[PDB]
Amino acid sequence: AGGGYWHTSGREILDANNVPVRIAGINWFGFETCNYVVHGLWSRDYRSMLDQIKSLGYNTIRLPYSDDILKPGTMPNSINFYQMNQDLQGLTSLQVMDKIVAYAGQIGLRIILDRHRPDCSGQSALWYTSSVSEATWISDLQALAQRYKGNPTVVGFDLHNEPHDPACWGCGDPSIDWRLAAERAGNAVLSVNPNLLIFVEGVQSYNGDSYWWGGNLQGAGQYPVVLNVPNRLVYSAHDYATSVGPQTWFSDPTFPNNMPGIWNKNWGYLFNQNIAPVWLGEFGTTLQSTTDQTWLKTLVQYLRPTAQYGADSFQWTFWSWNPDSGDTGGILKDDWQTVDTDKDGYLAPIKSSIFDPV
């Protein structure tokens, strides 16, 4: 399954033949760093990396980027070309991206593009900065959509990674109201290719409740995102455990009984109420603490195991493939070859199936 562009039906995603599909994937980061390319291509051929990811079961890649790679002539600076990656030599960051998108499509993976940073120096709480403007943001998103227009390997865009304070949901002040910005961006995108899915994260705070960045969708119920094209909107949250940082509820004595409550309040409800599909776009942990391990165990059940519920379940993409994330660690170990199969162990129940070749 997975052929052609995709669409929504209630809380499910469907391919072009109206078969339900489940996004159950991984984050491979680096094109949003100042290396301007996915990491680990200093040790691995990229096709070999992609094959390993498929082999392990992940069917979708969330591909973080920054707007720096759209500056003309921007080039990767951490690729090894000895006996590997030979066809990437002399390519721009964008030419390299082309390459990754194609092989991945050829082998049954899918790609979601993620405006993860305005520039390679770091994330922004708002969708714009003094240096990178909304207009540039939007032009870039359109530039990328036009660039993959016709290749359903890229199924849609995560408009902006992890909006947070002082972003607001529905407050009406156009300088900080992410709900309105999201529509601006989204319709710009669908104006180029109306078959793409639009993934919108939450903010961090709402009606005095605060959650993880990009995780708070509590205001989406009353102030929904409305796009020019129907059946394109996927809401998305992020969630973490203590390896990333401290939250009141890990200390709650009834943990992790509390968790589904917190999840449902912040993003769960949209799925339970059948309003829209929901994507846990980013989540992970080093699994160093018992707490984190209960968390992951619990979370995985919450997301609805594929065997009991199939594609009528939460979409997800784990953080991350890369071992070089302090806070979470990765699927691969420091050698960029050896799998942390125990970690991979946890995600088994919610994995699903590779898609059809594009």
CSV table of C-alpha atoms in Angstrom, one decimal:
chain,number,residue,atom,x,y,z
A,1,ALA,CA,0.0,0.0,0.0
A,2,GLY,CA,0.9,3.7,0.0
A,3,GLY,CA,0.7,4.4,-3.7
A,4,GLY,CA,0.2,8.0,-4.8
A,5,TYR,CA,-0.5,11.0,-2.7
A,6,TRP,CA,-2.4,10.5,0.5
A,7,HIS,CA,-5.4,11.9,2.1
A,8,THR,CA,-7.4,11.8,5.3
A,9,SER,CA,-10.6,10.2,6.4
A,10,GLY,CA,-11.4,11.1,9.9
A,11,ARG,CA,-8.5,10.0,12.1
A,12,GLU,CA,-7.0,7.8,9.4
A,13,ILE,CA,-4.6,8.4,6.5
A,14,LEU,CA,-5.5,6.7,3.2
A,15,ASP,CA,-3.5,6.2,0.0
A,16,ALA,CA,-4.8,7.0,-3.5
A,17,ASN,CA,-6.7,3.7,-3.5
A,18,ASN,CA,-8.3,4.5,-0.2
A,19,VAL,CA,-6.4,1.9,1.7
A,20,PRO,CA,-5.5,3.1,5.2
A,21,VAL,CA,-1.8,3.6,5.9
A,22,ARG,CA,0.1,4.0,9.1
A,23,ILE,CA,3.2,6.3,9.3
A,24,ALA,CA,5.6,4.4,11.6
A,25,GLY,CA,9.0,5.8,11.1
A,26,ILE,CA,12.2,7.5,12.2
A,27,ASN,CA,13.9,10.9,12.2
A,28,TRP,CA,17.2,11.1,10.4
A,29,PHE,CA,18.6,14.6,11.1
A,30,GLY,CA,21.4,16.9,9.9
A,31,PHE,CA,20.2,18.9,6.9
A,32,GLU,CA,19.0,21.4,9.6
A,33,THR,CA,22.5,21.5,11.1
A,34,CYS,CA,25.4,23.6,9.9
A,35,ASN,CA,26.8,20.5,8.3
A,36,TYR,CA,24.0,20.9,5.8
A,37,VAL,CA,23.4,17.2,5.3
A,38,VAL,CA,22.2,14.1,7.1
A,39,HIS,CA,24.9,12.9,9.6
A,40,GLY,CA,26.7,9.6,9.4
A,41,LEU,CA,27.6,9.8,5.7
A,42,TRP,CA,31.2,10.0,7.0
A,43,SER,CA,31.0,6.4,7.8
A,44,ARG,CA,28.1,5.0,5.7
A,45,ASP,CA,27.0,4.9,2.1
A,46,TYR,CA,23.6,6.7,2.0
A,47,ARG,CA,21.8,3.9,0.1
A,48,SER,CA,23.2,1.4,2.5
A,49,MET,CA,21.8,3.5,5.4
A,50,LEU,CA,18.4,3.7,3.8
A,51,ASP,CA,18.4,0.0,3.2
A,52,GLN,CA,19.2,-0.6,6.8
A,53,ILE,CA,16.3,1.5,7.9
A,54,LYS,CA,13.8,-0.3,5.6
A,55,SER,CA,15.2,-3.6,6.8
A,56,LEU,CA,14.6,-2.6,10.4
A,57,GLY,CA,10.9,-1.9,9.6
A,58,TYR,CA,10.6,1.8,9.6
A,59,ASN,CA,8.6,3.0,6.7
A,60,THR,CA,8.8,6.8,6.8
A,61,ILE,CA,11.6,9.3,7.3
A,62,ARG,CA,11.0,12.6,9.0
A,63,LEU,CA,13.7,14.8,7.3
A,64,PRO,CA,14.6,17.9,9.3
A,65,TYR,CA,16.0,20.8,7.3
A,66,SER,CA,16.9,24.5,7.8
A,67,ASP,CA,16.4,27.3,5.3
A,68,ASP,CA,20.2,27.7,5.0
A,69,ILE,CA,20.2,24.7,2.5
A,70,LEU,CA,18.1,26.8,0.1
A,71,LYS,CA,20.7,29.5,0.0
A,72,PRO,CA,22.1,29.0,-3.5
A,73,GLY,CA,25.3,27.0,-3.6
A,74,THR,CA,25.0,25.7,-0.1
A,75,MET,CA,27.1,22.6,0.3
A,76,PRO,CA,27.4,19.6,2.7
A,77,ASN,CA,30.6,19.4,4.7
A,78,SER,CA,30.5,16.1,6.5
A,79,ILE,CA,30.3,13.5,3.8
A,80,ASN,CA,33.1,10.9,3.2
A,81,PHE,CA,33.6,10.0,-0.4
A,82,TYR,CA,36.1,7.2,-0.2
A,83,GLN,CA,34.6,4.0,-1.6
A,84,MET,CA,31.1,5.3,-0.9
A,85,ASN,CA,28.8,8.2,-1.6
A,86,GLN,CA,30.5,8.8,-4.9
A,87,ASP,CA,27.5,10.1,-6.6
A,88,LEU,CA,27.1,12.9,-4.0
A,89,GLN,CA,30.5,14.4,-4.8
A,90,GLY,CA,30.1,18.0,-5.9
A,91,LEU,CA,26.4,18.2,-5.2
A,92,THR,CA,24.7,21.0,-3.4
A,93,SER,CA,22.8,20.2,-0.2
A,94,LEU,CA,19.6,20.2,-2.2
A,95,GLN,CA,21.0,18.0,-4.9
A,96,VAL,CA,22.0,15.6,-2.2
A,97,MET,CA,18.5,15.8,-0.8
A,98,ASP,CA,17.1,14.9,-4.3
A,99,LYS,CA,19.2,11.7,-4.2
A,100,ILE,CA,18.0,10.6,-0.7
A,101,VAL,CA,14.4,11.2,-1.7
A,102,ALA,CA,14.7,9.1,-4.8
A,103,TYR,CA,16.3,6.0,-3.5
A,104,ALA,CA,14.0,6.0,-0.5
A,105,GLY,CA,11.0,6.2,-2.9
A,106,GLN,CA,12.5,3.4,-5.0
A,107,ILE,CA,12.7,1.1,-2.0
A,108,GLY,CA,9.3,1.7,-0.3
A,109,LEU,CA,10.0,4.4,2.2
A,110,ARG,CA,8.3,7.7,2.4
A,111,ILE,CA,9.6,11.2,3.4
A,112,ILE,CA,8.0,14.0,5.4
A,113,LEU,CA,9.9,17.3,5.1
A,114,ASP,CA,10.3,19.3,8.4
A,115,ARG,CA,11.2,23.0,8.6
A,116,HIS,CA,13.0,22.3,11.8
A,117,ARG,CA,15.1,25.6,12.0
A,118,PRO,CA,15.1,29.0,10.4
A,119,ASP,CA,18.9,28.7,10.0
A,120,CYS,CA,21.5,26.1,11.0
A,121,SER,CA,22.3,27.9,14.3
A,122,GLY,CA,19.1,26.7,16.2
A,123,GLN,CA,15.4,26.4,16.6
A,124,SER,CA,13.0,29.4,16.9
A,125,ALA,CA,9.9,29.7,19.1
A,126,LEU,CA,8.1,31.6,16.4
A,127,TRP,CA,8.0,30.8,12.7
A,128,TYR,CA,10.0,33.9,11.9
A,129,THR,CA,13.1,35.7,13.1
A,130,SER,CA,14.9,39.0,12.5
A,131,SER,CA,17.2,37.1,10.1
A,132,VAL,CA,14.6,34.7,8.6
A,133,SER,CA,11.2,36.2,7.7
A,134,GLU,CA,7.8,34.6,7.3
A,135,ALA,CA,8.0,35.4,3.6
A,136,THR,CA,11.3,33.5,3.3
A,137,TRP,CA,9.8,30.7,5.3
A,138,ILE,CA,6.8,30.5,2.9
A,139,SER,CA,8.8,30.9,-0.3
A,140,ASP,CA,11.1,28.1,0.8
A,141,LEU,CA,8.2,25.8,1.6
A,142,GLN,CA,6.7,26.5,-1.7
A,143,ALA,CA,10.2,26.1,-3.3
A,144,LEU,CA,10.5,22.6,-1.9
A,145,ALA,CA,7.0,21.6,-2.7
A,146,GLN,CA,7.4,22.6,-6.3
A,147,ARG,CA,10.7,20.7,-6.3
A,148,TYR,CA,9.0,17.4,-5.4
A,149,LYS,CA,5.8,18.1,-7.2
A,150,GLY,CA,4.9,14.8,-8.9
A,151,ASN,CA,7.0,12.6,-6.6
A,152,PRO,CA,4.7,11.2,-4.0
A,153,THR,CA,7.8,9.9,-2.2
A,154,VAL,CA,7.4,13.2,-0.3
A,155,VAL,CA,3.9,13.0,1.2
A,156,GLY,CA,3.8,16.4,2.9
A,157,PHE,CA,5.3,19.1,5.2
A,158,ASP,CA,5.7,19.6,8.9
A,159,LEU,CA,5.4,23.4,8.6
A,160,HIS,CA,7.6,24.4,11.6
A,161,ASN,CA,9.3,22.4,14.3
A,162,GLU,CA,8.2,22.9,17.8
A,163,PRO,CA,6.4,26.3,18.1
A,164,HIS,CA,6.5,27.5,21.7
A,165,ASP,CA,6.3,30.6,24.0
A,166,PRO,CA,5.3,33.0,23.2
A,167,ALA,CA,3.4,31.4,20.3
A,168,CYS,CA,-0.4,31.3,20.9
A,169,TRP,CA,-3.2,29.1,19.5
A,170,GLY,CA,-6.1,31.3,18.4
A,171,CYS,CA,-5.3,34.4,20.3
A,172,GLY,CA,-5.8,36.5,17.1
A,173,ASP,CA,-2.6,38.5,17.4
A,174,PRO,CA,-1.1,37.8,14.0
A,175,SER,CA,2.5,38.3,15.3
A,176,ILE,CA,2.3,35.2,17.6
A,177,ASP,CA,-0.8,33.2,16.6
A,178,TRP,CA,0.6,30.0,15.2
A,179,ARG,CA,-2.8,28.7,14.3
A,180,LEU,CA,-3.2,31.6,11.8
A,181,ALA,CA,0.4,31.3,10.5
A,182,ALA,CA,-0.1,27.6,10.0
A,183,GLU,CA,-3.0,28.3,7.7
A,184,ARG,CA,-1.0,30.9,5.8
A,185,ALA,CA,1.9,28.5,5.2
A,186,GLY,CA,-0.4,25.5,4.6
A,187,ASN,CA,-2.4,27.3,1.9
A,188,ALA,CA,0.7,28.6,0.3
A,189,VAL,CA,1.9,25.0,0.1
A,190,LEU,CA,-1.4,23.6,-1.2
A,191,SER,CA,-1.4,26.4,-3.7
A,192,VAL,CA,1.6,24.6,-5.3
A,193,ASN,CA,0.6,21.0,-4.8
A,194,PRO,CA,-2.9,20.4,-3.3
A,195,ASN,CA,-2.2,16.7,-2.9
A,196,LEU,CA,0.3,17.2,-0.1
A,197,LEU,CA,-0.5,16.5,3.5
A,198,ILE,CA,0.0,19.4,5.9
A,199,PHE,CA,1.3,18.5,9.4
A,200,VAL,CA,0.7,21.1,12.1
A,201,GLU,CA,2.3,21.0,15.5
A,202,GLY,CA,0.9,22.5,18.6
A,203,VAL,CA,2.3,25.4,20.7
A,204,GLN,CA,3.6,25.0,24.2
A,205,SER,CA,1.1,26.8,26.4
A,206,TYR,CA,-2.6,27.3,26.3
A,207,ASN,CA,-5.2,28.6,28.8
A,208,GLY,CA,-2.4,28.5,31.3
A,209,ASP,CA,-1.5,24.9,30.7
A,210,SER,CA,2.0,24.1,29.5
A,211,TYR,CA,3.3,21.0,27.8
A,212,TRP,CA,6.3,20.0,25.6
A,213,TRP,CA,7.1,22.3,22.6
A,214,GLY,CA,5.0,21.5,19.6
A,215,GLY,CA,2.9,19.2,21.9
A,216,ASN,CA,0.1,21.5,23.0
A,217,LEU,CA,-2.9,21.1,20.7
A,218,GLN,CA,-5.5,21.8,23.4
A,219,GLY,CA,-6.7,24.8,21.5
A,220,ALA,CA,-7.2,23.0,18.2
A,221,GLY,CA,-10.7,21.8,19.3
A,222,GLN,CA,-12.2,25.3,19.4
A,223,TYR,CA,-9.8,27.0,17.0
A,224,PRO,CA,-9.2,24.5,14.3
A,225,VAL,CA,-6.9,24.8,11.3
A,226,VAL,CA,-8.9,25.2,8.1
A,227,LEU,CA,-7.2,24.7,4.7
A,228,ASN,CA,-8.3,25.5,1.2
A,229,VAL,CA,-8.1,21.8,0.5
A,230,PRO,CA,-10.1,19.3,2.5
A,231,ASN,CA,-8.6,16.1,3.8
A,232,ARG,CA,-5.0,17.2,4.1
A,233,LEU,CA,-4.6,18.2,7.7
A,234,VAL,CA,-2.8,16.1,10.2
A,235,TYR,CA,-2.2,17.5,13.7
A,236,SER,CA,1.1,16.7,15.4
A,237,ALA,CA,2.5,16.6,18.9
A,238,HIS,CA,5.9,15.8,20.5
A,239,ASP,CA,6.4,14.2,23.9
A,240,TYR,CA,9.4,13.3,26.0
A,241,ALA,CA,10.5,11.6,29.3
A,242,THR,CA,13.2,12.6,31.7
A,243,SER,CA,16.4,12.1,29.7
A,244,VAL,CA,15.2,15.3,27.9
A,245,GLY,CA,13.9,16.9,31.0
A,246,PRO,CA,11.8,17.2,34.1
A,247,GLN,CA,8.0,17.4,34.2
A,248,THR,CA,5.7,17.4,37.2
A,249,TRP,CA,3.9,14.2,36.2
A,250,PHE,CA,7.0,11.9,36.3
A,251,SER,CA,6.9,12.6,40.0
A,252,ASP,CA,3.2,12.0,40.3
A,253,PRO,CA,2.7,9.1,42.7
A,254,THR,CA,0.2,7.4,40.3
A,255,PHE,CA,2.6,7.3,37.4
A,256,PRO,CA,2.2,6.3,34.7
A,257,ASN,CA,-1.5,6.1,35.3
A,258,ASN,CA,-1.6,9.8,34.9
A,259,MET,CA,0.0,9.7,31.4
A,260,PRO,CA,-2.9,8.9,29.1
A,261,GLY,CA,-4.7,11.7,30.9
A,262,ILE,CA,-2.0,14.1,30.0
A,263,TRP,CA,-1.7,12.7,26.5
A,264,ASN,CA,-5.4,12.9,25.9
A,265,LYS,CA,-5.7,16.4,27.1
A,266,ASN,CA,-2.9,17.7,24.9
A,267,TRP,CA,-3.3,15.8,21.6
A,268,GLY,CA,-5.1,12.5,22.2
A,269,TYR,CA,-8.6,14.0,22.1
A,270,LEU,CA,-8.3,14.9,18.5
A,271,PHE,CA,-7.9,11.2,17.6
A,272,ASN,CA,-10.4,9.8,20.2
A,273,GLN,CA,-13.0,12.4,19.0
A,274,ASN,CA,-12.3,11.3,15.4
A,275,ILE,CA,-11.5,14.9,14.4
A,276,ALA,CA,-8.2,14.3,12.6
A,277,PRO,CA,-5.3,11.9,12.3
A,278,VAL,CA,-2.6,12.6,14.9
A,279,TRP,CA,1.1,12.3,14.4
A,280,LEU,CA,3.7,11.9,17.2
A,281,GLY,CA,6.4,13.4,15.1
A,282,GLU,CA,9.1,13.4,17.6
A,283,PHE,CA,9.7,11.4,20.8
A,284,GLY,CA,12.6,9.3,22.3
A,285,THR,CA,14.7,8.6,25.3
A,286,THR,CA,18.1,7.1,26.2
A,287,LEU,CA,16.1,4.6,28.3
A,288,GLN,CA,18.7,5.1,31.0
A,289,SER,CA,16.0,5.4,33.8
A,290,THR,CA,13.3,3.1,34.9
A,291,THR,CA,11.0,6.0,34.6
A,292,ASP,CA,11.8,6.6,30.9
A,293,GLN,CA,11.4,2.9,30.3
A,294,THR,CA,7.9,2.8,31.8
A,295,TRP,CA,7.1,5.9,29.8
A,296,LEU,CA,8.1,4.3,26.5
A,297,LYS,CA,6.3,1.1,27.4
A,298,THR,CA,3.2,3.0,28.2
A,299,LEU,CA,3.4,5.4,25.3
A,300,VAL,CA,3.8,2.5,22.9
A,301,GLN,CA,0.6,0.9,24.2
A,302,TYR,CA,-1.2,4.3,24.1
A,303,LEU,CA,-0.3,4.7,20.5
A,304,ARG,CA,-2.3,1.6,19.7
A,305,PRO,CA,-0.4,-1.6,18.6
A,306,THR,CA,-0.7,-2.4,15.0
A,307,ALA,CA,-1.8,-6.0,15.6
A,308,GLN,CA,-4.9,-5.0,17.6
A,309,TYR,CA,-5.7,-1.9,15.7
A,310,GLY,CA,-3.9,-1.6,12.3
A,311,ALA,CA,-3.9,1.8,10.6
A,312,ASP,CA,-6.7,3.0,12.9
A,313,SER,CA,-4.0,4.3,15.3
A,314,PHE,CA,-1.5,7.0,16.0
A,315,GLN,CA,1.0,8.0,13.3
A,316,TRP,CA,4.6,8.2,14.6
A,317,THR,CA,8.2,8.8,13.8
A,318,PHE,CA,10.8,8.2,16.6
A,319,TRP,CA,13.8,10.4,17.5
A,320,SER,CA,16.2,9.3,16.3
A,321,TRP,CA,18.1,7.2,13.8
A,322,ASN,CA,21.2,9.2,14.7
A,323,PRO,CA,23.3,8.2,17.7
A,324,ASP,CA,24.5,11.7,18.0
A,325,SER,CA,21.5,13.1,20.0
A,326,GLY,CA,22.6,13.6,23.7
A,327,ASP,CA,19.1,13.7,25.3
A,328,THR,CA,17.6,10.6,23.6
A,329,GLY,CA,20.4,8.6,22.0
A,330,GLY,CA,19.5,6.8,18.8
A,331,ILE,CA,18.5,3.5,17.1
A,332,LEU,CA,22.1,3.1,15.7
A,333,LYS,CA,25.0,3.0,18.2
A,334,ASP,CA,28.1,5.3,18.0
A,335,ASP,CA,29.5,3.2,15.2
A,336,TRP,CA,26.7,4.1,12.9
A,337,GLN,CA,26.3,0.4,12.1
A,338,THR,CA,25.3,-1.5,15.2
A,339,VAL,CA,21.6,-1.3,16.2
A,340,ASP,CA,20.3,-0.7,19.7
A,341,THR,CA,18.0,-3.6,19.3
A,342,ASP,CA,16.6,-3.4,22.8
A,343,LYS,CA,15.4,0.2,22.1
A,344,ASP,CA,14.2,-0.9,18.7
A,345,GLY,CA,12.5,-3.7,20.7
A,346,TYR,CA,10.1,-1.2,22.4
A,347,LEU,CA,8.8,0.1,19.0
A,348,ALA,CA,8.0,-3.3,17.5
A,349,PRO,CA,4.3,-3.3,18.5
A,350,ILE,CA,3.6,-0.1,16.7
A,351,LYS,CA,5.6,-0.8,13.6
A,352,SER,CA,3.7,-1.4,10.4
A,353,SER,CA,4.6,-2.2,6.8
A,354,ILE,CA,6.9,-0.9,4.1
A,355,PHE,CA,5.1,0.9,1.3
A,356,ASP,CA,5.0,0.2,-2.4
A,357,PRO,CA,7.9,1.3,-4.5
A,358,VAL,CA,7.5,4.8,-6.0
